[PDB]
Design a protein around this ligand. Structure first.
Ligand SMILES: [Mg+2]
Ligand SMILES: [Mg+2]
Ligand SMILES: [Mg+2]
Length: 265
């Protein structure tokens, strides 16, 4: 059998944190932006969000009324991934979060860094996503995403964030990153259970071909073999991406992870 994550509060590296048991509420926010008709148009991001929608509702018990999907092919304004709609949807996603909830966030679109002009550090950069209206309202930055989606969460609430944009863990101010090689990044800590999956690589605008590889690989890995440890998830993602893309899978987290534990969805 598998080893499920422990249910007691954990101490690790001067941090208290709790793994989600994934027995709580299942809500998801899925964002696919093709920037349709613009010079930064992409072709597959909306499809990426639909593919994650189908995976979550078919295999993970998510109900359609519990998923907000924002894609820019929509004629209804409230379904468009405008910055203000993304912010309101991120607030919806975490409202009411409890320990053991299973919240899901997916972003497929452009990503990069912008100068952190108020940041009390020269050459300091914000890590950002690009809402469809970014040419008129700017990006949505790490600080905001972290403040809405992470800082709010109770101990033991899961947020599983899947980025198709090749962000690093800095996009959600996560202190830990794991690869198939082990710990590749480690240290205001959260006790929640925030994990992030993303590929290693204003940096997507000329490299749009690596966008979308992670959700495709994730769905493929999890469909072929639903039983995964965090270790095998990263190995199987690595195997799924190795030829077709240069990006490598990276698991970022708000807390240390014993990779031998089961990765529960
Ligand atoms: Mg700033
Ligand atoms: Mg930052
Ligand atoms: Mg694609």
């Amino acid at each position: 059998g598998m080893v499920r994550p422990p249910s007691s509060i954990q101490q690790g590296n001067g941090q208290q944190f709790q793994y989600s048991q994934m027995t709580g509420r299942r809500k998801a926010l899925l964002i696919g932006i093709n920037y349709i008709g613009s010079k930064n148009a992409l072709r597959g991001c909306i499809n990426d969000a639909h593919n994650i929608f189908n995976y979550l509702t078919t295999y993970c018990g998510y109900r359609p009324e519990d998923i907000v999907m924002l894609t820019d092919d929509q004629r209804e304004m409230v379904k468009i991934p405008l910055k203000e709609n993304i912010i309101r949807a991120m607030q919806w996603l975490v409202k009411d979060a409890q320990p053991n909830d299973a919240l899901f966030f997916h972003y497929s679109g452009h990503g990069g860094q912008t100068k952190d002009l108020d940041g009390d550090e020269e050459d300091g950069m914000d890590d950002v996503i690009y809402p469809v209206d970014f040419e008129s309202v700017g990006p949505l930055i790490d600080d905001t995403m972290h403040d809405i989606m992470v800082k709010s969460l109770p101990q033991g609430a899961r947020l599983t964030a899947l980025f198709d944009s090749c962000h690093s863990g800095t996009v959600l101010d996560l202190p830990y990153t794991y690869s198939t090689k082990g710990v590749i990044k480690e240290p205001k800590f959260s006790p929640a259970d925030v994990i992030m999956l993303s590929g290693s690589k204003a940096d997507t605008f000329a490299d749009g071909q690596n966008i979308g590889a992670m959700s495709h690989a994730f769905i493929s890995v999890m469909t072929r073999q639903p039983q995964q440890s965090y270790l095998s998830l990263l190995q199987n993602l690595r195997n799924e991406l190795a030829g077709k893309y240069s990006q490598k899978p990276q698991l970022s987290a708000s807390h240390p992870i014993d990779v031998n534990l089961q990765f529960i969805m």
